[PDB]
Amino acid sequence: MNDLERLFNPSAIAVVGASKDPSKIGSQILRNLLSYGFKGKVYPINPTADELMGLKCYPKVSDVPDKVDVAVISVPSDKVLGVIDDCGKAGVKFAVVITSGFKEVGNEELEEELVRRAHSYGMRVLGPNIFGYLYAPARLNATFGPKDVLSGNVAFISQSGALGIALMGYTVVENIGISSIVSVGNKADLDDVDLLDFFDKDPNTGVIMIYLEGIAPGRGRMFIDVASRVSLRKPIIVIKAGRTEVGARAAASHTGSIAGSVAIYESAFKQSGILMAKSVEDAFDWTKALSWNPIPEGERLIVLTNGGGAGVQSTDTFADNGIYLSKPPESLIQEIKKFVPPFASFANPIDITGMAPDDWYYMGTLAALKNPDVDALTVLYCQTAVTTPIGVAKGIVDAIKEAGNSKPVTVGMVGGPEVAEAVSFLNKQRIAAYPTPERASSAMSALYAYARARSYVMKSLAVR
Amino acid sequence: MNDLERLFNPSAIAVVGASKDPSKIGSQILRNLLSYGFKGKVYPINPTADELMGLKCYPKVSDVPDKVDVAVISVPSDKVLGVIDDCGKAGVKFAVVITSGFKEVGNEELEEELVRRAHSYGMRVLGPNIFGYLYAPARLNATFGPKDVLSGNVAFISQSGALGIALMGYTVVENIGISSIVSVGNKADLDDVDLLDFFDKDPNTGVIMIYLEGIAPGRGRMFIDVASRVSLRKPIIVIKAGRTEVGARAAASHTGSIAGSVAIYESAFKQSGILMAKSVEDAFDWTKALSWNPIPEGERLIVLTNGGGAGVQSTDTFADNGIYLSKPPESLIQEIKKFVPPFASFANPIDITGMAPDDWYYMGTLAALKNPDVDALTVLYCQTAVTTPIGVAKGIVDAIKEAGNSKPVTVGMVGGPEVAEAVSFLNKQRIAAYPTPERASSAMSALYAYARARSYVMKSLAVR
Amino acid sequence: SSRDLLLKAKENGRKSLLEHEAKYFISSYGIPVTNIRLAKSEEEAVNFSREIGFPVVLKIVSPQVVHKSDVGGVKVNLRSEEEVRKAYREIIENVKRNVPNAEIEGILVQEFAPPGVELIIGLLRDPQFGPTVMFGLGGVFVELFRDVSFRVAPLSEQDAESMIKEVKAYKLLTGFRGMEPVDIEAIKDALIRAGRIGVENEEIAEMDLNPVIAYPKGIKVVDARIILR
Amino acid sequence: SSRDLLLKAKENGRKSLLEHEAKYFISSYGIPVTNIRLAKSEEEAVNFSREIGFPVVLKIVSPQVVHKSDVGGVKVNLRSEEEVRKAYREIIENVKRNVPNAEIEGILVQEFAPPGVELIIGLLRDPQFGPTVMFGLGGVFVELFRDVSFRVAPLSEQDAESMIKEVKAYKLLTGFRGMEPVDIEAIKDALIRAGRIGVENEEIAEMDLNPVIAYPKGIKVVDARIILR
Ligand SMILES: CC(C)(COP(=O)(O)OP(=O)(O)OC[C@H]1O[C@@H](n2cnc3c(N)ncnc32)[C@H](O)[C@@H]1OP(=O)(O)O)[C@@H](O)C(=O)NCCC(=O)NCCS
Ligand SMILES: CC(C)(COP(=O)(O)OP(=O)(O)OC[C@H]1O[C@@H](n2cnc3c(N)ncnc32)[C@H](O)[C@@H]1OP(=O)(O)O)[C@@H](O)C(=O)NCCC(=O)NCCS
Ligand SMILES: [Mg+2]
Ligand SMILES: [Mg+2]
Ligand code: NA
């Protein structure tokens, strides 16, 4: 009852509440399921329809001549308990309850009855009040959100419906590759803890991003225990809703709950090795970098820049994150002195001057990455007439390939429309690129933050 | 002279060091002057050429049969003093010295002599070591940066070369309308105070953004005095380079200067009513909002959202900036209750729920703006199935027009590619729109931070 | 078993431990306390005072005292067998007088606490995370500025060390004007044990070790309150 | 003119004002100081101490001694002439023994300072911004935690008020356990006047009012340093 393998990888899924009316939510889910390419059996359930979207329809899940793993329930709340009973009779393992009108509108009684009854059949509940879920490795889009996402290794769990389903679309724009989207909504039964356990053991998932408004009473200890063990291998980024006192009360009112302690949540996340994001932008910028790079093996981070200004913005940003640069290895300085002028600066950042052509980015990036005393690289570029943005990007691509290793790299590029395209180009290659030097630096700082978070957890688990 | 009217609006400009070779800096500047459409006289200056780009060329500025206001000097440092002498003889008032190789490479004596020589002829020096300057109302692009900018009311002053010329290009991407770009580089003579004095009186300029690494010894008092009075009418945003100790050393070596005190600069900025941005993105987000909006008359800020999660992200972001939301006026709550369901929230943020169709954004936005007891509005949108991003955006535009008034508005929209277009649509109409609720809230926070900064200055200038 | 202190209190319907009981309970977990004895007779008070060493504080022990200072239930800086016998009778005579209806558990003989750096160690139960340890510097730093750190129990050595270094007043522990560096290992050790107390004893609702005094070598809890549920 | 003190000091090649001269100077600007007399005789001290009232504090005025306490040049709480009189010779010996290089301007007689909330008011010259005033709370708050605010002079009433509210230890001014709120207006007044001293007197490189005591009514500068250039 605590393994979620058949939720994410079902053989058969029923959609209860799909209709001949294509505008209904049930129908929208069914359309996403078929167009995203689910290869198992899909069972529309409707009282009267003979078929929906070319599939044989049944009036009850219990009429389906097959073992249904998952039932996506899109009927009004006054109908839900009846569908649960029939799912229970049919041996359904998971009820994914889209339906709203439970604890979030003050009807806790109905919600607790829903969970009570599902459990009497050995059935778990996701939600209620959710937009569904997606699992890319099973080609399963059981949401009424966008019909597609970029495939990748990021799992995104959201307690928020509207922001969750919107961020699902935002991942495409920000080039974030997704393994799963899970709407948890009211969290009446299955929650973050249950999901982390699954994503811990999921080889398709390498990073976990959570939008979290609150943890249930009595559940926090289990949360730290699971998240800390996940964090040893996979970074967890939490966007905490209500991270200010004022906001905690606002979240405390949005959900129907008393306001958790801000300070104690912060400490729980630290003890979990969790990275707390203060914003969507930070969370996505960090997710990109953590998805696409290994953690650095040491603190010999190099910043390479064709302008002092960007370098100083970077330095200040790194310093705000407790990251301080040190002198570059003399082997590296010697390597770069082969092509840069003598009024170049080598303090770290390594300033190759505003006169640097495209090729110096290739040569500079290659030299840094191949050097055995360099652990990570942030490449900064300010667009000038002596260069082309795409040429610089392609230089970075080639240097990364040539070096034939994986050291973390982030790229900050500042300029006009040509830079926007070059940055887009890099991100499509899964090279973490950003349109400012502070964002590229913030993203690299996330890689270090995670390495320090993992180390915190390792140390706290040390055997006496 | 201290008056820069004829630096920015010259009748005649000379480009010293333009060449038959179109790749050289002088030639790039000359090319930008003609394409951006300068209407005065342009005099290419070159030792041998008879004409450059269809214009009569002269070997010396002093041979030009005209009063030359501005000489743009793009010859090697060893030839600069010679050109200054000639310009001096010719009665030139402003020497815009592109050339590098002065204080920033350790040649102090040469820089001081450049200035000494200019002043003996009553000539002011911009630079040296700069990429030039642009002034849109004079259709004057005397830079070797991008050929074009969007026209508007923002003046951007930059002490950094490479970052400066790249940010010039970034303004286009971020839809920021520019009145002026000024590279000040080494600041050997003309500096921020002189420019601020000009932009104070310039009716084309409404907002001043400065990338600032440092101020000259003995210049800071005058800086406060001037910036203070400017801030009474025009917002100044400063991107401070070296606002951490390690970064202060980082900028100390890029520039040829010692690092000033971080804490005292920050107090000086507070006494000047200046908004200090820690990043390019913050500065540009804030500049955009300050450029397109009046300051709020009071503290009755309303947040309108179709998502609870977005609303709490906003609340937290406002709280971090010292901004706290109050319950909306009863008359507004009544106006909105006419179309929203009972499970809508009115705590502020006003949550019109996730099922809000496009036109509820029109009606909601209109009601808030028209209401006498609402001073400012932040509208948040999460892309759901029931809305269209562009429809929501057009509703916000229509509501702003139909309200008639000018109250500050910012917009935060989350979703896929359709949101990115809607956001772009709003920005091209000079409605400050952002792809996340935190950036929309941070932008509105800057409008309030500026109102508060202006108040700090007004109270400090109080008569005893 | 030190749990007898908790069971005894529960049975008598008390919602907290008496201050000597809280100290004994804490002590049983290996958290150091300022030395104390409960005097049954005057002869024992005198003998205890010699054992504990002068100067001693004498105070009435009874579940009835809301404020021990103002029932004449506290005599201070007693430096001799003479002065002990004197105060031992003034207290009882005065406390019998002003609150006769009050079962006198006894009179507490308390060791002098040399001056040092004051700390707060606390334990509370968060609805989400359960027993949580709190650390702060004493005096105004917690009471006025609320400069505190929290770790969810049980605490590892890593948790204890980082939460100490995290408070803004940390430098008061590493040496300043007129004060040597104090024993951080002792502090870590007490924090971990405070966490253990909370994890193991579900009947303890909260605990405040305050003041705790840190010295160049070791720490000593001066006062301890334990609330039951 | 009080500028005569600056001129005298410059003429004698000195690079700071003597402690009593510093306080006279400060006082002439309307910043309240603890009362003082410079004793040129064992007899005059004892009188000046009879006059100023009691108790008094005695310390050495010498162009050559800077950190006074560790050379034994500071004696305290001297209620009778006789109580003082031993101190006069007592310090004299102690400085004679340990600074025979030092020049003895006299011994300083200092009026007593009731305890209060201690403050620092500073004046420095920043290369960019010129005369700058700084504020912070005394003791560990400036010295250890570096909790200070700055304002470029001259200071408006707004500058003074906001820089006071800005420091982290600000609540030490608005009432806490065993301490009333102090006179914020009087602090603001002194801050503004400190700024005026810097703007007007180019010969002053640096000034340190430390400690300054804040009371419910008024403030008093206890010690002042003025550095010349
Ligand atoms: C779940 C919800 C969408 C259903 O609303 P609805 O589609 O308008 O409701 P309906 O009554 O039309 O029922 C849907 C279909 O299920 C059918 N149905 C009803 N009871 C049924 C049952 N026991 N078994 C199978 N089908 C059933 C209905 O007949 C209808 O099909 P039809 O069009 O052929 O008649 C709605 O109640 C709701 O909760 N909306 C908000 C949900 C939400 O936003 N959640 C996300 C938060 S991010
Ligand atoms: C200013 C600078 C670009 C000139 O270098 P350059 O163009 O390669 O040097 P040149 O000598 O070829 O260019 C000067 C041109 O003017 C001519 N010239 C030289 N002295 C002259 C004089 N006194 N009067 C008129 N023309 C003169 C030269 O003949 C040449 O023209 P040509 O092609 O016909 O021979 C270079 O010295 C420099 O400083 N580069 C960096 C600038 C920079 O980046 N600044 C901003 C940092 S953001
Ligand atoms: Mg929610
Ligand atoms: Mg909602
Ligand atoms: Na440079």
Rounded to a whole number of angstroms, the distance from the CA of D59 to the nearest CA of chain B is 36
Chain C residues in contact with D139 (beta carbon < 8 A): 177
Q: Give the H or E element holding residue A426.
A: helix A417-428
CA nearest neighbour of B243 among B213, B271, B269, B219: B213
What whole-number distance in Å separates Cα of residue D39 and Cα of residue A121? 97
What whole-number distance in Å separates Cα of residue B228 and Cα of residue B269? 9
What whole-number distance in Å separates Cα of residue B196 and Cα of residue B244? 25
- Among protein residues, the one with the nearest Cα to ligand 1's atom 10 is A75
Rounded to a whole number of angstroms, the distance from the CA of B266 to the nearest CA of chain D is 9
Helix ranges (DSSP H) in B272-416: 280-292, 308-320, 330-337, 358-370, 389-403
Domain-wise residue ranges, chain C: 1-34+113-229, 35-112
Kindly give, in sequence order, each residue whose CB lies less than 8 Å from that of residue C146, ignoring residues fewer than 6 positions away. Answer: none
Domain-wise residue ranges, chain A: 1-129, 130-293, 294-464
Helix ranges (DSSP H) in A36-150: 77-90, 108-120
How distant, in Å, are the alpha carbons of A176, B229, B430, D146 from that of B423? 20, 35, 11, 45
Can you read off the two tokens belonging to residue B274?
């200046």
CATH of segment(s) B1-129: 3.40.50.720
Chain D residues in contact with B224 (beta carbon < 8 A): 129, 152
What whole-number distance in Å separates Cα of residue B413 and Cα of residue C113? 62
Q: What is the dihedral of CA A60, A66, A69, A73, to 10 degrees?
A: -20
CB contact under 8 A, B308 and A162: yes
Q: Is B439 helix (H, G, I), strand (E, B) or coil?
A: helix
What whole-number distance in Å separates Cα of residue D72 and Cα of residue A73? 87
Kindly give, in sequence order, each residue whose CB lies less than 8 Å from that of residue D120, ignoring residues fewer than 6 positions away. Answer: D134, D135, D136, D137, D138, D142, D148, D208, D209, D210, D211, D212
Chain B residues in contact with D158 (beta carbon < 8 A): 456, 459-460, 462
CA nearest neighbour of C187 among C154, C221, C151: C221
How distant, in Å, are the alpha carbons of A278, B214, C164, C187 from that of C148? 22, 38, 9, 15
Of the candidate CATH numbers 3.30.470.20, 3.30.590.10, 3.40.30.10, 3.20.20.120, the domain formed by D1-34+113-229 belongs to: 3.30.470.20
CA B152: distance to chain centroid?
A: 10
Interface probe for C, chosen from A267, A456, A457 (most Cβ of C below 10 Å), is: A267
Ligand 2 site, residue B129, Cβ cutoff 6 A: yes
What per-residue string of b and e applies to D21-34 under the rule 16 or more CB within 10 Å gives b?
bbbbbbbeeebbbb
Give the homologous superfamily in CATH for domain B130-293.
Answer: Succinyl-CoA synthetase domains (3.40.50.261)
The answer to whether residues A169 and A146 touch, using CB atoms and an 8 Å cutoff, is yes
- Tell which atom from ligand 2 comes closest to the C-alpha of B49: 34
Tell me: cis bond preceding B128? Omega within 30 of 0 counts. Answer: yes
Rounded to a whole number of angstroms, the distance from the CA of D131 to the nearest CA of chain B is 9
Kindly give, in sequence order, each residue whose CB lies less than 8 Å from that of residue D86, ignoring residues fewer than 6 positions away. Answer: none
The answer to whether residues B17 and B95 touch, using CB atoms and an 8 Å cutoff, is no
Q: How long a stretch of residues is chain D?
A: 229
Interface probe for D, chosen from C145, C168, C173, C210 (most Cβ of D below 10 Å), is: C145
Using a 10 angstrom Cβ sphere, with 0-12 exposed, 13-18 middle and 19 or more buried, the burial of residue A397 is: middle
Can you read off the two tokens belonging to residue B86?
């000639």
Method used for this model?
Answer: X-ray
DSSP per-residue codes, B53-111: TTEE-BS-GGGSSS---EEEE-S-HHHHHHHHHHHHHTT--EEEE----SGGGT-HHHH
The answer to whether residues B83 and B73 touch, using CB atoms and an 8 Å cutoff, is yes
Can you read off the two tokens belonging to residue B40?
């005065």
CA D154: distance to chain centroid?
A: 21
Closest Cα in chain A to C127? A217
Ligand 2 site, residue B19, Cβ cutoff 6 A: yes
**CATH architecture, range C35-112:** 2-Layer Sandwich (3.30)
Kindly give, in sequence order, each residue whose CB lies less than 8 Å from that of residue B34, ignoring residues fewer than 6 positions away. Answer: B42, B53
The strands making up A151-158's β-sheet, listed across from edge to edge, are A140-143, A132-135, A178-183, A151-158, A207-212, A236-240, A275-277
Residue found under tokens 């249930």: A216
The answer to whether B1-129 and B130-293 have equal CATH topology is: yes
CA nearest neighbour of A43 among A67, A14, A17, A22: A14
What whole-number distance in Å separates Cα of residue C76 and Cα of residue B197? 72
Tell me the sheet residues that pair with A70: A13, A94
What whole-number distance in Å separates Cα of residue A389 and Cα of residue A433? 12
What whole-number distance in Å separates Cα of residue B138 and Cα of residue A232? 61
Q: Are strands C219-221 and C130-137 parallel, antiparallel or unpaired?
A: unpaired
How distant, in Å, are the alpha carbons of B332, C177, D136 from that of D146? 48, 14, 8
What whole-number distance in Å separates Cα of residue A410 and Cα of residue A408? 7
Q: Is A42 helix (H, G, I), strand (E, B) or coil?
A: strand
Tell me the sheet residues that pair with B89: none
How distant, in Å, are the alpha carbons of A18, B360, B389, C191 from that of B339? 28, 8, 20, 56
The answer to whether residues D216 and D175 touch, using CB atoms and an 8 Å cutoff, is no
The answer to whether residues C129 and A221 touch, using CB atoms and an 8 Å cutoff, is yes
The answer to whether residues A428 and A175 touch, using CB atoms and an 8 Å cutoff, is yes
Tell me the sheet residues that pair with C179: C176
Closest Cα in chain A to C124? A264
CATH of segment(s) A294-464: 3.40.50.261
Using a 10 angstrom Cβ sphere, with 0-12 exposed, 13-18 middle and 19 or more buried, the burial of residue A233 is: exposed
What whole-number distance in Å separates Cα of residue B187 and Cα of residue B160? 11
Tell me: cis bond preceding B349? Omega within 30 of 0 counts. Answer: yes
User: Phi, psi at residue B230, to the nearest 5°?
Assistant: -60, -45
Residue found under tokens 């007044």: D189
Q: Is B136 helix (H, G, I), strand (E, B) or coil?
A: helix
CA A422: distance to chain centroid?
A: 24
Q: Is the dihedral of CA C173, C175, C179, C185 positive or negative?
A: positive
DSSP per-residue codes, B215-266: --TT-HHHHHHHHHHHHTTS-EEEEES--SHHHHHHHHHHTTS----HHHHH
Q: Is B380 helix (H, G, I), strand (E, B) or coil?
A: strand
Single-letter residue type at C192: I
CA nearest neighbour of D17 among D189, D206, D218: D206
Residues with CB under 6 A from ligand 1: A 16-17, 19-21, 24-26, 45-48, 74-76, 79, 82-83, 98-101, 129-131, 161; B 354
What whole-number distance in Å separates Cα of residue D130 and Cα of residue D120? 19
Single-letter residue type at A90: A
Kindly give, in sequence order, each residue whose CB lies less than 8 Å from that of residue D100, ignoring residues fewer than 6 positions away. Answer: none
What whole-number distance in Å separates Cα of residue B230 and Cα of residue B271? 12
Beta-strand (E) ranges in A213-337?
A: 236-240, 275-277, 301-305
What whole-number distance in Å separates Cα of residue B80 and Cα of residue D21? 55
Q: Are strands D130-137 and D148-152 parallel, antiparallel or unpaired?
A: antiparallel
What whole-number distance in Å separates Cα of residue B113 and Cα of residue B121? 13
CA nearest neighbour of A142 among A82, A83, A182: A182
What whole-number distance in Å separates Cα of residue A179 and Cα of residue A171? 11
Single-letter residue type at C139: G
In angstroms, how far apart are the furthest CA atoms of chain B?
Answer: 82
DSSP per-residue codes, chain C: -THHHHHHHHHTT-SB--HHHHHHHHHTTT--B--EEEESSHHHHHHHHHHH-SSEEEEEE-TT-S-GGGGT-EEEEE-SHHHHHHHHHHHHHHHHHH--SS---EEEEEE-----EEEEEEEEEETTTEEEEEEEESTHHHHTT--EEEEESSPPHHHHHHHHHHSTTGGGGS-BTTB----HHHHHHHHHHHHHHHHH-TTEEEEEEEEEEE-SS-EEE--EEEEE-
| Neighbour tally for C101: CB within 10 Å | 5
Using a 10 angstrom Cβ sphere, with 0-12 exposed, 13-18 middle and 19 or more buried, the burial of residue A429 is: middle
- Tell which atom from ligand 1 comes closest to the C-alpha of A165: 48
Ligand 2 site, residue B82, Cβ cutoff 6 A: yes
CA nearest neighbour of B53 among B31, B36, B70, B72: B31
Q: Output the CA angle A397-A399-A401, nearest 5 degrees.
A: 70
Q: Give the H or E element holding residue D79.
A: none
